[PDB]
Design a protein around this ligand. Structure first.
Ligand SMILES: *C/C=C(C)/C=C/C=C(C)/C=C/C1=C(C)CCCC1(C)C
Ligand SMILES: *C/C=C(C)/C=C/C=C(C)/C=C/C1=C(C)CCCC1(C)C
Ligand SMILES: *C/C=C(C)/C=C/C=C(C)/C=C/C1=C(C)CCCC1(C)C
Lengths: 209, 209, 209
């Protein structure tokens, strides 16, 4: 029915497959710390899966009215990003043994970043959508700012490159500028999410970090 | 007005009475740890009380449309379950001195379980309600999976038997199959909640755990 | 358009200015603990800023119907209070090195307090609004109940006097009794918020606590 349904079904299946591979490999962990990284890495695609399923089936999509049109917004992404992004940041934070001040700041910065994105996504006044997009980007640069060693650096670097693509997709997407159709927007985000999560997941859990 | 109002008023009063008994008995605690268990055990019926009051009075109930009918759904239960279930799991987790990996996994598993229940409760497509019910049940079996010693075992066992009744109520309830009228569904859930919370509460706080 | 817009623009700017002053002064912190207090103190006006911006522009305001009228409610305040109040309580809690039982209880008490305020704010049955206001006040007295030493005492005392003004504003405001117009209500709350946050912020971060 919806042309981006295939990307949605394809994200759901891939988040589904990542959760499981990780649940199974996670059996044989006595290490308190590896338990921490295994819990986080698996939870991320797990919550991700559920939200991809929500979007795939009509739940997780609304028509936000702006520009003289009702616009299809997939709100369910922010409900996923709300929990997964702080946890990915928790893997990195934990990985390099960061302090409370930093992890909290990182996680707090994360909250407002995804928190302003939702508002930008839901704002009925076209112009303002971009004001909120801006506050979100600034929170991101703060996180990228604040952001064993070898595997951390490779992960810190994967994070940086992948996350920075999100605001651009939002900006050019059907969410911002409206030049990129929802299709490829759902496709691009599906590629970002399975990498930032499953790719990130593998790199990490497969490592000796 | 609503026939299950009595169960709602009866749940509110009982959650009300459990919160208080616990607040008062909680006075005389110097123990850092007993403080932890006292804070959790009291918070649970406390948040519970507020949500029973919300449902009792019209707030906390919506008409979800499916099956060619508008259906009365008590969304307020998921707003309560969202916070109380992870805390009950926190009593057990803390009780047996579980690791970060486990408690997080438990709490993360909990979130999606109640998180998928809400979506199942709110899904307008009858068929899908059960797809989400299924993902929720699987998260539960994961928790029951992962799930001093004497009092833990009695508590672990109370949890297991009580929580497993919830999906069945949802499934046969006015939320799922629609064979059990809302009345007895509100009644059964009122009995599950006052046990999983007040009963659990007593067993625990009354113990030497 | 809205007469309280100036208070909203004036709160946004002031929360904006507090966040920044704190972000900049927060550069030169090697102390794990000062990092904790710097992360919290800055996050508070930061989340505050975003919610003042939300209210300033139409997002963050709804017409709740009661009394035979549709009433302008600024729901966005509860979305801010939800996160900032537990963090202000975290500064104090951390400041005096409180236990897990206490901080959790404090934070849990906080949640229901702001959590009942939102419901009171959203209740369509005029009479009930006050029932929920009451449960919220009781949670507050519980927090004020539970509530280096010199700077803690000055902060504990600032908290107490400022927070106690909130329920009265709500009660006499356009949210409760409806005797105080939204204008001065937005003005009074703007003064409470910039003090409880920026004032509190300065007192604390400027100190040797
Ligand atoms: C698994 C998903 C991840 C890591 C998602 C990350 C999303 C972002 C970093 C989004 C950022 C945005 C902005 C900076 C501006 C507003 C729009 C957003 C939410 C797309
Ligand atoms: C105090 C309340 C407690 C402990 C409530 C527990 C509720 C559950 C374990 C619910 C489980 C459900 C499913 C497994 C499937 C979807 C429907 C639910 C939410 C009833
Ligand atoms: C930065 C904001 C702060 C510290 C806000 C605090 C707000 C309160 C303490 C509000 C309390 C309320 C009641 C006790 C009853 C219901 C209405 C409220 C939410 C205004």
């Amino acid at each position: 029915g919806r042309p981006e349904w295939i990307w949605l079904a394809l994200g759901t299946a891939l988040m589904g497959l990542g959760t499981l591979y990780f649940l199974v490999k996670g059996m044989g962990v006595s290490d308190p710390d590896a338990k921490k990284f295994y819990a986080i890495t698996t939870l991320v695609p797990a919550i991700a899966f559920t939200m991809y399923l929500s979007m795939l089936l009509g739940y997780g999509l609304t028509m936000v009215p702006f520009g003289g049109e009702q616009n299809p917004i997939y709100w369910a992404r922010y409900a996923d990003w709300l929990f997964t992004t702080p946890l990915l940041l928790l893997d990195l934070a934990l990985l390099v043994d960061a302090d409370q001040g930093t992890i909290l700041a990182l996680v707090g910065a994360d909250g407002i970043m995804i928190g302003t994105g939702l508002v930008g996504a839901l704002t009925k006044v076209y112009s303002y959508r971009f004001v909120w997009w801006a506050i979100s980007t600034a929170a991101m640069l703060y996180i990228l700012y604040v952001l064993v060693a070898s595997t951390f650096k490779v992960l810190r670097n994967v994070t940086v490159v992948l996350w920075s693509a999100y605001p651009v997709v939002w900006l050019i997407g059907s969410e911002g500028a409206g030049i990129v159709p929802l299709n490829i927007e759902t496709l691009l985000f599906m590629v970002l999410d399975v990498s930032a999560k499953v790719g990130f997941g593998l790199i990490l859990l497969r490592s000796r970090a």
